[PDB]
Symmetry: C3
């Protein structure tokens, strides 16, 4: 385990997702409101899944070697298994907040699936130049998601409760900034151009992941917006 | 096929899931009620999926060799492919019975996914001691599911029709007893401590599977609880 | 890339799915109706997914070699990854058109999953004779889907708006004819009996895919049936 310099960030990531999971689980114990239960369910599942996949990376299961550039390159494939489930869940949190129509939810989740799936293919592609073709397609899918979060959702929120509008706005901004960093880290890290070494890359992803999941969740679950308006 | 002593239980399992599938399909032919159609759909799909995966194990496709303990260990991975889809379907049957809120359904299905996914990782893990780490996490996810089935669902059922309350109670009890045996069999069988040989392990899983799927389905689909109250 | 004679059909397929995707995306820009948004979302996702998987086949990622018949046989596994997601989406388009009950939708999607999953197992099976066992099970699942599209849906459509009835009828007929060709092509092509060479097989699948996705989508998205009745 300790033979990989990035182990420390995997261990920290595992611990923080674990602690985040336990905290949200305990916090959601005293919740009977059906709307709030949905948000607690979605939001607690996110670090729970991330916990399992961080642990899989820490123990070495979620790592494979991919030959490109005439080298055996360590690729943590478990990230994509995580993101495949957790990024649509995060989008669902946002979509449910603003009472998105079903068509838009399907568009988001579908685009997200394409984003992660093509990122995975890019990560495992042995022809070096083609890795960036997949990166570009995945990034286009991300750009679509970001467009919808801004020019389909933000104007929907203004027509809703002020607490849901303000909470959505914060979470939207957090999401757009944090999510946009991922293709950059991939591009310059071990999966892409290889300018940033894997240990630093792992640190960067860990900071992004904890912020995008536990940070996000802390903001969401402390908000009154997740409760139905009741007396 | 006959070169594996466990083939007989795989063959029997295949036949019983097949027959179970055909029986539920025929039985559901004369059903127009929209609620009953949901239960027939869910409940017929369960042995249909199990049929395909038993057949895959029988024909040898759903088997791989995993090196641990300095041995090549036969691991039937197809079980997890089965359970990944059939256990949430079984939980959906229960959840729909008691008209569970969406948040609770998501919690159940999500926990179930974690249960099966981590069981799969445990099954394929090459570091012997780590297999039991995954077993423990999976078992914790199972315990969460069982907690919800008792302390989130049972009190919901009492507020519903007597036929749905009584049927849920029976199916809940069947589910908790049968499902709890699976981590025990895994732990002592070829995936875990290796005390019980694979042929007996396969027998045990076959008895559990047929009971948890066809047995469960027979109880559910004979009940009046799957029909909306109509005149 | 050009080393495989079928590359031309993969390239054409990629281009046509890409163009189809862009066309539906642009066309759906000026849509606010919640019902129409659902259909645009579903129908645009279908060629988008197919685009990615055609590209994966073109670049060689979505190809593996399967030993059977004492030969190394090129099997494009990416087709199943495509179909796993796009065929239920296509069925959802049809089901939503006729306002299918949830039980029937689950039956369709479930049968479809079995159809594609067993086709995949058949495609990767190393025992030649067993490949056709999987083909038969998959074809039985297809026959179930076709039965439901005719003897569960058609009589539902007649009870609905004339525009939805007529559009459903056309799309149903297109779907039944086109989908039925797939098991035939598989059976006689490289996955099955090997009578038709892979380059021609790839052409046939490309024509079917573009017709079943872009052709289908063009018919659906030009129809008034995807809009709620409004003044
Ligand atoms: C009802 O709706 C609210 C429940 O959602 C909240 C329910 C949660 C989504 C349930 C999912 C968590 C499962 C209990 C997972 C079990 C293992 C966890 C990964 C625990 C790991 C953290 C610990 C080991 C440090
Ligand atoms: C609505 C939305 C959800 C839509 C989703 C968008 C989605 C279509 C985007 C593309 C997803 C697709 C790329 C997933 C591919 C998974 C693949 C990387 C798994 C690894 O297999 C790749 C090679 C080794 O590199 O296997 C060696 C060859 C082996 C023989 C491989 C054979 C097994 C195949 C992998 C079977 C395909 C199953 C499905 C791809 C499962 C989906 C997995 C998940 C990652 C989407
Ligand atoms: C409408 O809602 C009720 C239909 O659900 C019931 C519909 C069923 C869920 C449909 C799923 C069954 C498919 C027909 C699968 C086809 C192959 C089966 C595995 C048949 C195998 C048994 C036989 C070969 C012994
Ligand atoms: C809401 C709920 C549904 C949440 C679900 C909870 C879920 C997160 C729990 C964990 C699921 C995750 C462990 C699934 C892992 C699948 C993996 C075992 C497949 C086999 O690949 C493992 C190694 C060989 O041992 O592959 C050799 C290396 C290869 C290069 C592997 C690369 C391909 C990757 C497998 C791509 C990942 C795709 C997804 C994991 C598909 C999910 C499969 C299913 C089993 C969940
Ligand atoms: C809101 O509901 C309507 C939007 O659905 C329509 C939304 C679409 C379903 C969104 C899915 C498309 C994504 C934008 C995918 C991005 C990459 C595409 C594959 C583009 C490829 C075509 C081009 C490169 C030739
Ligand atoms: C409600 C509906 C959706 C129901 C769906 C119906 C469905 C049950 C029908 C059967 C699906 C099932 C056959 C999928 C099998 C995927 C499998 C082909 C992936 C490739 O792995 C096969 C072998 C190499 O040939 O791997 C070499 C051995 C490796 C060690 C394999 C270990 C990893 C396993 C693949 C883990 C299983 C994960 C799930 C099968 C993911 C589903 C993938 C998708 C194709 C259904
Ligand atoms: C909790 C984890 C999160 C929120 C991860 C989000 C990941 C992304 C937004 C990844 C995007 C990528 C691209 C846009 C292209 C390059 C490859 C990816 C997958 C890193
Ligand atoms: C129809 C099949 C059923 C109902 C199978 C259920 C399986 C489980 C409840 C399995 C649980 C496991 C654990 C709790 C940890 C050990 C590994 C598993 C996957 C066997
Ligand atoms: C857009 C792609 C479409 C509509 C593909 C549809 C594919 C099928 C209907 C495939 C059916 C098969 C069988 C019925 C058995 C043989 C194997 C398959 C998977 C080709
Ligand atoms: C979106 C964040 C991308 C910026 C990443 C900056 C990382 C700087 C770390 C120094 C690079 C290490 C190179 C020498 C080993
Ligand atoms: C490929 C995995 C996609 C599924 C991710 C799980 C989250 C799905 C959320 C469903 C949103 C509801 C749409 C109507
Ligand atoms: C990883 C596979 C999970 C999907 C299993 C299929 C059953 C899902 C049931 C969905 C329940 C509805 C939730 C609102
Ligand atoms: C194995 C992949 C199955 C999921 C395919 C995605 C489409 C699912 C459509 C869901 C229909 C809604 C059912 C209530
Ligand atoms: C085009 C949609 C406008 C809002 C999205 C902001 C785009 C941020 C660019 C991210 C950079 C990724 C490499
Ligand atoms: C803690 C929830 C109470 C109901 C669940 C019963 C737990 C049964 C233990 C199963 C043993 C698994 C090894
Ligand atoms: C049995 C359902 C009647 C409508 C389905 C038509 C069946 C077409 C046969 C397709 C041939 C596949 C090999
Ligand atoms: C070896 C790198 C070759 C450059 C490939 C860049 C492709 C990026 C695609 C963006 C449209
Ligand atoms: C393929 C990238 C798409 C980003 C621009 C958005 C196009 C308009 C979409 C309107 C729903
Ligand atoms: C070789 C066996 C070593 C014991 C591992 C047991 C781990 C179980 C984890 C329960 C918390
Ligand atoms: C991680 C195992 C959880 C089992 C105990 C239940 C904790 C309380 C959950 C309340 C929804
Ligand atoms: C080598 C071919 C052997 C014939 C197998 C055909 C099986 C088809 C199953 C249809 C019930
Ligand atoms: C297993 C093939 C099934 C095709 C015939 C349909 C049987 C009746 C189903 C009624 C819903
Ligand atoms: C509750 C604390 C969870 C921490 C477990 C994972 C940390 C890795 C330690 C090596
Ligand atoms: C309808 C009977 C189904 C039995 C087929 C599978 C049994 C295995 C026989 C070797
Ligand atoms: C918009 C045009 C998309 C075409 C890209 C794929 C075609 C393959 C060219 C070799
Ligand atoms: C992106 C950083 C999130 C900060 C989380 C703090 C939560 C305090 C309520
Ligand atoms: C767990 C055993 C189930 C027994 C099924 C019998 C069904 C008869 C109605
Ligand atoms: C199966 C062929 C479909 C033809 C599509 C033409 C669409 C024109 C409206
Ligand atoms: C990590 C355990 C949380 C302790 C309770 C915090 C207040 C809800
Ligand atoms: C007005 C909301 C600002 C949130 C920005 C957070 C950036 C990490
Ligand atoms: C809208 C601001 C996005 C900032 C992107 C930063 C990526 C590191
Ligand atoms: C396995 C075939 C079932 C025969 C009909 C049973 C009575 C519905
Ligand atoms: C009161 C219901 C009892 C059911 C127990 C079944 C145990 C297998
Ligand atoms: C509530 C009783 C559970 C019994 C567990 C038996 C496991 C073999
Ligand atoms: C492929 C681009 C489509 C151009 C607009 C067509 C009319 C909606
Ligand atoms: C009456 C609808 C006829 C459609 C047939 C299309 C065959 C490809
Ligand atoms: C209902 C007519 C089906 C035609 C099947 C054609 C397959 C090539
Ligand atoms: C909570 C489980 C953590 C396992 C870490 C083992 C190194």
């Amino acid at each position: 385990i300790t033979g990989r310099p990035e182990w420390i960030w995997l261990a920290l990531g595992t611990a923080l997702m674990g602690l985040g999971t336990l905290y949200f689980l305990v916090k959601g114990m005293g919740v009977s409101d059906p709307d709030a239960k949905k948000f607690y369910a979605i939001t607690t599942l996110v670090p729970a899944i991330a916990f399992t996949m961080y642990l899989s990376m820490l123990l070495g299961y979620g790592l494979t070697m991919v030959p490109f550039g005439g080298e055996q390159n360590p690729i943590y494939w478990a990230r994509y298994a995580d993101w495949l489930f957790t990024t649509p869940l995060l989008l669902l949190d946002l979509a449910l907040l603003v009472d998105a129509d079903q068509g838009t939810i399907l568009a988001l989740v579908g685009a997200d699936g394409i984003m992660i799936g093509t990122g995975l293919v890019g990560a495992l592609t042995k022809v070096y130049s083609y890795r960036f073709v997949w990166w570009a397609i995945s990034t286009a899918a991300m750009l679509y998601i970001l467009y919808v979060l801004f020019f389909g959702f933000t104007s929907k929120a203004e027509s809703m409760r002020p607490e849901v509008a303000s909470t959505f706005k914060v979470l939207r901004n957090v999401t757009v900034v944090l999510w946009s960093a991922y293709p950059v880290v991939w591009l310059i890290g071990s999966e892409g151009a290889g300018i940033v070494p894997l240990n630093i890359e792992t640190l960067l992803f860990m900071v992004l992941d904890v912020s995008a999941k536990v940070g996000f969740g802390l903001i969401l679950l402390r908000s009154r917006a997740i409760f139905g308006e009741a007396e």
